[PDB]
Design a protein around this ligand. Sequence first.
Ligand SMILES: CC(=N)/N=C(/NS(=O)(=O)c1ccc(C(F)(F)F)cc1)N1C[C@H](c2ccccc2)C(c2ccc(Cl)cc2)=N1
Lengths: 478, 123
Amino acid sequence: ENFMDIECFMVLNPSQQLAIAVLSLTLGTFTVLENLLVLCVILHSRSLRCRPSYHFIGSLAVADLLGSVIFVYSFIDFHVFHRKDSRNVFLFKLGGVTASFTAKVGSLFLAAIDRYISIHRPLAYKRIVTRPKAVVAFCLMWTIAIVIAVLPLLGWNCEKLQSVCSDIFPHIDKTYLMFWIGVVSVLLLFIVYAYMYILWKAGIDCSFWNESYLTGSRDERKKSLLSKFGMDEGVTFMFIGRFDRGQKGVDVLLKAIEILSSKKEFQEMRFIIIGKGDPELEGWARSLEEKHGNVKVITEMLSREFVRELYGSVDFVIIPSYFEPFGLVALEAMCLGAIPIASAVGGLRDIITNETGILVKAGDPGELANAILKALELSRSDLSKFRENCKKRAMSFSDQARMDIELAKTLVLILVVLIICWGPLLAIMVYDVFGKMNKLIKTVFAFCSMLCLLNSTVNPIIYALRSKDLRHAFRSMF
Amino acid sequence: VQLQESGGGLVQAGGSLRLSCAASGTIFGPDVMGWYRQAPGKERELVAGISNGANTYYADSVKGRFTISRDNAKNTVYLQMNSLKPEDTAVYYCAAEVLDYTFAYLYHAYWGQGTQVTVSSHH
Ligand SMILES: CC(=N)/N=C(/NS(=O)(=O)c1ccc(C(F)(F)F)cc1)N1C[C@H](c2ccccc2)C(c2ccc(Cl)cc2)=N1
């Protein structure tokens, strides 16, 4: 009839009852100090609360605090004092613990959604996931957890309905318990599914543009590709993109090809052009394809692995676009070792340096011609230094993605620790819902109910072990 | 997705105009957005484009007189033009492309109905 029933399991002699009391007190105090440490290092750091991706850390710690302090409070009113709790105090205590667990699950929910938006929609992440939106969503989750916790205090106790209610929880009705555990279990299984999908899909896509999936060597693959196109060996150039006027300078490339067709070095310059669009530019490309034997034009839709094979086979890639907001084509080319000769516009300005490719003016067939003959002259010597420099430059643009994967791994670790800690306890409530029990099941309920405080203990250890930024912030105080 | 445009009509020469285009998508809607113009009996031309921040492109014939802005709270684009010239009488379309991060060749483009803009120097 009282919260904190320690008088059960009379095996505890007074020689060890004080030991149990002092270990529970020290564990509760340790959890409280760890949680306040996590909050104060979060709030004294500008770089941690300004990132929404870390926000749930604070939320998680706050939820664990609701499991810590309440426990300590509940441990004082029965040993240090002997105040018998009424219905209101028992309802408040049980509501606080249930609110702590539900807020933990909801924080994992919002963290999973943020991870999906960050990893698999990286262009939309910095505009969708804002700080006010994340704060509002966390507040809404906390308030709905608080409301569903405090529902029995508003008149959903079992003496009001005049019906049968639970035995391990006096003044708690059966229907409220099964509804709460159903909601929490459904949300937990959804989060397991979501994190599994996020980590699975990002594994097969983050590392796709790399030569580790390409067999053979450079010159052998180039010779096989050029024989596949019915050409001899030579300095190869590539273009892939949309066939339109205004976005990508395919017409600039065609004018440059026409200009180089009148020169004496066109026999050492093979060209591949991939794309589709307006019929006039397609017709011009096809006319240059039939006029010269060393220019190949592909119109049909291609597979991603075919483009990966093409990037690591050709020597140079031309990106003469007018408006390039992202330059993903440059990243995919440079990751596979293909020296770019691109236009210095948009996102192409700050990705190619003076030692990682050649830069031209936008919409300049003459400057493109000069750069392509300069690249032809440069290709006479060795080129492996430029290939390794481009690989080092382009692999340095995926560092944020790898840290996002590491954060998602940390979140999966936190989720499975929470699952391990709260599994058997919610299983005891499940078996309470379906069938009665004896005193042994209540005993193991009381024994494994300390796993909640153990979860609150081990969460800041995971936070300090995994996060480098949090570790550096903690090392900044001393 | 669905796109709605507003701001068409007749403008006295030398004036200024605001065009608005709103999109209804499910996740951020369009990644990159743009305004196109089509003169009567002429091909479409890229007149404005933006993704976010300082990623604005204006054509060489409209540079310095056309500015593009994007509001992300309502997911819309605004085109401001000033000192209009009578070769700008055209049907303006709103184009919105989502582009895939995994494969740079993939893109999905969506279009508006277009609004007629007639700038007149007649006094
Ligand atoms: C009746 C009963 N089980 N109460 C006890 N412990 S206890 O007093 O029995 C007890 C004490 C100490 C020890 C020993 F030996 F390990 F130290 C053993 C038993 N909790 C502990 C646990 C909890 C964790 C966090 C905050 C507050 C309470 C809890 C509980 C958890 C989830 C739900 Cl949903 C409902 C309730 N109730």
